[PDB]
Structures are given as C-alpha cells and as structure tokens.
Design a protein around this nucleic acid. Structure first.
Ligand SMILES: Nc1ccn([C@@H]2O[C@H](COP(=O)(O)OP(=O)(O)OP(=O)(O)O)[C@@H](O)[C@H]2O)c(=O)n1
Ligand SMILES: Nc1ccn([C@@H]2O[C@H](COP(=O)(O)OP(=O)(O)OP(=O)(O)O)[C@@H](O)[C@H]2O)c(=O)n1
Ligand SMILES: [Cl-]
Ligand SMILES: [Cl-]
Ligand SMILES: [Cl-]
Ligand SMILES: [Mn+2]
Ligand SMILES: [Mn+2]
Ligand SMILES: [Mn+2]
Ligand SMILES: [Mn+2]
Ligand SMILES: [Mn+2]
Ligand SMILES: [Mn+2]
Ligand code: NA
Ligand code: NA
Length: 326
DNA sequence: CCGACGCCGCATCAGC
DNA sequence: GCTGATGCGG
DNA sequence: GTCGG
C-alpha cells in the first residue's frame, strides 16, 4: 500500500457516486482506477505519473495532484460535511439497504442506526437481518477461522451426500489472510447443464447446516443461490465468534470451471476479464464462454476443461487465483 | 466527440 | 397467479 | 470518469 492514501480517496469517491449520486459507471471508473493504482509498484509522486495507468484520466489526475499536495481533497471534505450524503452513505452500510432505500429512509427522517432499530417494521427481511448483525458484518474473518468454517461446510455436505463437492472461493481462494465473508461453490452430479435429476439440492444442504446450527439466518434463498448468516461454535466459557455472512451457489457440475473462475473473482478482475473477452469476441459468464456473432449475439458454448482454457480463448496468460485480487 | 462500460440470482413491485 | 422492471448484492 | 475508434 504505497499509495494507500490515494486509493482510499478514490474508493470514497466511488462510494459517493454509487450511494448518493446513483451513478454506477462513475462508481466503477473510480474502483477501476483505485484497483490499477493499487497494484502499481511505485509510490506515485504525481498525477501525470498516475495518468499513465489505464483507467486513470484527467480528472483523477487532477484529484491526485491535490491530494499529494494537501493530503486531502476538497470535494470529499465537502461531501463528508453534507448531512444528506453522510446519512445516505451510512444507511447503505446495512445489507439490503441500497442507494434507493437509503435516500427513501433519509427522506422519512430515518437516518441513524438508532432510527433504524426503532423502525424495524419499515424494513424488509434482508434489511432486518443486515441491521441485526450490522456490527458483526463489519468485522473481517481471519484465515484460521475460514479454515475452521471450511471444514464444517465440507464435512456437513458429505453428510448429506458424498457426491457433493463444495469449494470455497472468493477472497479465500485468492489466498487472502482475511476475508469479509465466506463464498461456497457447490456441485452435485445430479445437476448438470443438461438435466435437473434432483430437487431441493441446495435446500438439503442449507437444512443440514442449520440443523448443526452453523447457518443462523437467511437473507435470500432460491434453487441455486443462498445468501445468509453463519457462525462457528464457541468453546466452554469462550465468547462467541462474530456472526458471518455466507453465500452458497449451486452450479451445473459440468460447468465447474466457469463457475469457480466466476466466484473466485475478484469482482473487478471479472469486470476486466469479461470486458477483454468482449474485446476478443467472446462472452463469459459463470456457466459458459461463448463466441459473439457478427451481430453481437452469443453463439454456442465452447469446450472448457480447466480455468486456463478460458484464459486461452481471450489470449491472456493464465493468472493464479492469488494474482486476481483486483 | 460517442457509445459502451460484466453478467446474473433472488425479492419486491406494478400492472394485467 | 404471471411477466417485466427495478433494487440489491454476488 | 475513461477509453477506443
Ligand atoms: N465444486 C467442485 C469442485 C471440483 N469439481 C471437480 O473436481 C475436479 C478437480 O478437482 P479439484 O482439485 O478439487 O478442483 P480443480 O481446481 O478443478 O483441480 P483441477 O484443475 O486439477 O481439475 C474437476 O475436474 C471438477 O470436475 C467439481 O465437480 N465440483
Ligand atoms: N460485483 C460482483 C461481486 C462479486 N462477484 C464474485 O463473487 C465473489 C464473492 O463476492 P465478495 O464476497 O463480495 O468478494 P470477495 O472477493 O470474496 O471479498 P471479501 O474478502 O470481502 O469477501 C467475488 O470474488 C467475485 O468472484 C462478482 O462476480 N461481481
Ligand atoms: Cl454512471
Ligand atoms: Cl480527503
Ligand atoms: Cl450461458
Ligand atoms: Mn464483503
Ligand atoms: Mn467473499
Ligand atoms: Mn460473499
Ligand atoms: Mn452476533
Ligand atoms: Mn469499453
Ligand atoms: Mn482516448
Ligand atoms: Na490513463
Ligand atoms: Na447495503
């Protein structure tokens, strides 16, 4: 983090553009700039120097020059002082409360943690659980705890059916020493691109994890995606572990490689990789990589037998999970 | 300048 | 109830 | 906000 100060500034800027301005493309531009700057191996000495990076344009170049000179950015100092922006930014920190709901709540005079608690009845289920575990969800997860959580998920899954394969992805697969949450990829041979030979495949698994009191709440749940809350068991007299966010994603077993690539990320890595794919004439999702027709219409799925095979198609050298944290 | 900017699951809403 | 749009977050 | 074209 040679440029930690600059990247923090951009990140705050992006957050403003998303939560207050509701400008998703500006949100993404800042995040892209923050990401590129973040892997740049020199302490940036000037805006001109940063503007050599792809993603960093004239405005960000100017903002960087101001930051390096003063240590601050007037634009931000102002935003920080605007109550509406401050409140909207805060409220969006609760899971399930987005920029729209945040601006709505602040219109009603609901604008603090306390207002939220006193108005649970105005929250949907997701928002209610996000607020319940607000403080908890702020905390990160040491890798040691992720290893613990991994053993529990992987072993309980075999208790439901030994044909199941659960793979922890997200930041954990990228080798991060701590994760904001746990992301699990699930396959079962009875669920492929070609048929759904069994129902409840995800339910079965969610239930068992609840049965053993690992999963504690649910944010949302469908036939292939579960979003909820979990917690490690604590020892005698031991204070309890923080409640943690968990997402489980059941994908067609034949499409594992696109799946694991997709849920491994990072989110920005994906955005960069899929756009380059578009530049190279393919579309990549969590299921498939397909060619674009002269019209811009996805063709048929190409044969994939490894994550590397996906990289090949778009003419990128393979990058280990650890080198995908953009 | 201009159009594009990754791609998708689930929850909720409106409208029929 | 269904279908499409919008929110939200992955 | 940035970029290829
Ligand atoms: N959630 C998972 C994880 C693994 N696989 C299967 O397990 C094999 C590979 O085993 P593993 O080392 O655990 O996964 P990979 O990272 O894909 O290893 P490799 O690249 O050597 O196949 C893959 O062919 C895939 O079919 C699966 O079906 N579902
Ligand atoms: N906008 C997004 C967000 C998420 N992801 C995928 O979902 C995974 C998990 O999402 P998230 O948990 O939010 O990201 P992590 O990289 O795991 O970060 P953290 O350490 O905070 O959990 C990401 O790695 C990425 O593969 C994505 O495709 N696009
Ligand atoms: Cl935008
Ligand atoms: Cl600042
Ligand atoms: Cl597809
Ligand atoms: Mn997170
Ligand atoms: Mn994660
Ligand atoms: Mn996650
Ligand atoms: Mn708790
Ligand atoms: Mn582009
Ligand atoms: Mn240009
Ligand atoms: Na640039
Ligand atoms: Na939120």
């Amino acid at each position: 983090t040679l440029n930690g100060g600059i990247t923090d500034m951009l990140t705050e800027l992006a957050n403003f553009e998303k939560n207050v301005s509701q400008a998703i493309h500006k949100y993404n531009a800042y995040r892209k700039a923050a990401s590129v700057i973040a892997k740049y191996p020199h302490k940036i000495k000037s805006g001109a120097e940063a503007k050599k990076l792809p993603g960093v344009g004239t405005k960000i170049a100017e903002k960087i020059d101001e930051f390096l000179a003063t240590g601050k950015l007037r634009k931000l100092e102002k935003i920080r002082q605007d109550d509406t922006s401050s409140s909207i930014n805060f409220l969006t920190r609760v899971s399930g409360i987005g920029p729209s709901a945040a601006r709505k709540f602040v219109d009603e005079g609901i604008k603090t943690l306390e207002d939220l608690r006193k108005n649970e009845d105005k929250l949907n289920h997701h928002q209610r659980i996000g607020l319940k575990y607000f403080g908890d969800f702020e905390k990160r997860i040491p890798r040691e705890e992720m290893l613990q959580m991994q053993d529990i998920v992987l072993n309980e899954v075999k208790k439901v059916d030994s044909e199941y394969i659960a793979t922890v992805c997200g930041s954990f697969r990228r080798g991060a020493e701590s994760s904001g949450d746990m992301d699990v990829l699930l396959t079962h041979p009875s669920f492929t691109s070609e048929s759904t030979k069994q129902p409840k495949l995800l339910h079965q698994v969610v239930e068992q994890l609840q049965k053993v009191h690992f999963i504690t709440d649910t944010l949302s749940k469908g036939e292939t995606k579960f979003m909820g809350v979990c917690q490690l068991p604590s020892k005698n007299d031991e204070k309890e572990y923080p409640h943690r966010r968990i997402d489980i994603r059941l994908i067609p077993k034949d499409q594992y490689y696109c799946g694991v690539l997709a849920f491994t990320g990072s989110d920005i890595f994906n955005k960069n990789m899929r756009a380059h794919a578009l530049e190279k004439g393919f579309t990549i999702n969590e299921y498939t990589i397909r060619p674009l027709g002269v019209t811009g219409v996805a063709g048929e799925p190409l044969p994939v037998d490894s994550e590397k095979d996906i990289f090949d198609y778009i003419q990128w050298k393979y990058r280990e999970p650890k080198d995908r944290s953009e």
